[PDB]
Design goal:
The structure is a homodecamer.
Chain A: E1 2-6, E2 9-10, E3 15-17, E4 20-24, E5 27-30, E6 33-34, E7 37-41, E8 47-48, E9 60-62, E10 65-67, E11 71-78, E12 82-83, E13 86-89
Chain lengths: ~90, ~90, ~90, ~90, ~90, ~90, ~90, ~90, ~90, ~90
């Protein structure tokens, strides 16, 4: 007998994130769980899994990556529940 | 006997995110769960899974990636439930 | 006997996101679940899965990617339920 | 008999993050759990899993990565629930 | 008989992070748990898992990595729940 | 027993007179609300009765007060003479 | 027993007179609220009664007060003469 | 027993007179609220009664007060003569 | 027994007179609130009664007070003559 | 027994008179609150009663006071004559 009990009774005014998981029993992936609460911000990726035998013979390649600019990211209360408070971005 | 019990009784005024999962028993993927609560912001990807034998022989390639500009991202309360509060972006 | 019980009784004024999943038992994908609550903002992708043997022989390629401009994204309460509060974007 | 009991009774106004997991019994991955609460900010990756035998013979390659620019990231209360407080970004 | 009991009764206004795990019984990975609460900020990676026999014979390579620019990261209360306090970033 | 109030008046006065000569919830022999003013008064769940919600009672009570309400009153319970009372908006 | 109040008046006065001559919740023989003013008064759960919520009672009580409310009062319980009372917005 | 108040008046005065001549919750023979002013008063759970919440009672009580409220009062319980009372916004 | 107050008046005064001649919660023979002012008063859980929360009682009591509230009062319980009372914002 | 107060007045004065001639919680024969002012007063859990929270009682009491509150009062219980009372913001 397997019994999972999460947050039986709630009677206030909470701010709650819940995640309950129960299990019983070039690239390869199998029977996984990923990114339940994932925040990806300004994520880069240039070359990935190009394939089998890229640029096999006599290949001349020039690679350049210039990340250069005025960028502004302003975040308040990321992944953070709250209650009876004041979140202000002035 | 498998029994899962999540948030039986609620009688206030909450702000709740729930996610309940139950299971019983070039690129390859099989029987997974992904991105239940996923926030992807300003995500880039240039070359991926081009195929089998790209640019096999005598291939001349010039690659350039210029990320350059005035960009502004303003987010308040990302993935964060709240109650009885004040979220303001002035 | 498998029994799943989520949010049996609710008698207030909540703001709730629910997601319940029950299971019993070049690119390949099989029997998955994806993007139940997915927010993709300003996501780019240039080359992907071009096919089998692109640019096989004697291929001259010039690649350029210029991301450059004044862009403004303003979001309040992303993926965040709330109650009895004040969300204002002035 | 396996019994898991998490947060039986709640009657105040808390801010709670929960994550409960129960289990009973070039690249390869199998039966894992990843990124339940993962925050990836300004993460880069240039070359990864290019494939089998890239640049096999007589390959001339020039690689350059210039990360150079005025960037500003401002975050308050990352992955941190709170209550009865004041989070302000002026 | 295995019984796990975490946070039976809560009646104040706390700020709590919980993570409960129960288990009963080129690159390879198997039956692990990773990144339950992982914060990756300004993480770089240039070459990784290029494949089998890259640059096998007569390979001329020039590698350069220039990380050079005015960058500002300002974070308050990272991975730190709090209550009845004042978090301000002026 | 002799009582005299304002026996002679010759001036045009504004007078507000009140003369009285005497020789669960239970009240008796009371004189209530002589010149009583009651503005914007509330009452929730008054005098429910005997034995309410005796057994296994679940109650969720929520009272909310809000909204733009504007009360403008001049000269409350105040007689006046030879004056000027103006309420201009 | 002799009582005299304002026997002679000759000036046009503003007078507010109150003369009185005497020779669970229980109240008796009281004189309540003579010139009583009651503005913006609240009361939650008053005098529920005998034996309320006796056994196994669950109660969630939440009272909220808010909202733009503007009260503007001039000359409360204050007679005036030969003056000027103005409420200008 | 002789009482005299303001026997002769000749000036146009603003007078506020109050003359009195005498020869669970229980109150008796009281004189309450003569010129009583009650503004913005609250009361939560007053006089519930006999034996409330006797056994196994769960109560979550939350009271919140907030909101833009503006009270502007001039000349409370204060008679005036030959003056100027102005409330200008 | 002789009492004399303000027998002769000839000036137009602002007078606030109060003359009195005498010859669980229990109160008796009291004179309460003669010229009583009560502004912004609170009361939580007053006089619940006999035997409240007798056995195995769980109570979570939270009281919050906040919000922009502005009280502007001039000349409280203060008669005036030949003056100028102004409340300008 | 002879008492004389302000027998002759000829100047237009601002007078605030109060003359008195005499010949669980229990109070008796008291004179309370003659010219009593009560501003911003609080009271939590007053007079719960006989035998509250007798056995195995769990109580979590939290009281919070905050918020922008502005009180501006001029001339409290202070009669004035031939003057100027101004409240300017």
């Amino acid at each position: 007998p397997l019994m999972v009990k999460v947050l039986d009774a709630v009677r206030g005014s909470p701010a709650i994130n819940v995640a309950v998981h129960v299990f019983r029993k070039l690239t390869t992936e199998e029977e996984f769980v990923e990114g339940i609460y994932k925040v990806e911000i300004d994520t880069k990726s240039y070359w990935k899994a190009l394939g089998i035998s890229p640029f096999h013979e006599h290949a001349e390649v020039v690679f350049t990556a210039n990340d250069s600019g005025p960028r502004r990211y302003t975040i308040a209360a990321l992944l953070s529940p709250y209650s009876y408070s004041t979140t202000a971005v002035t």
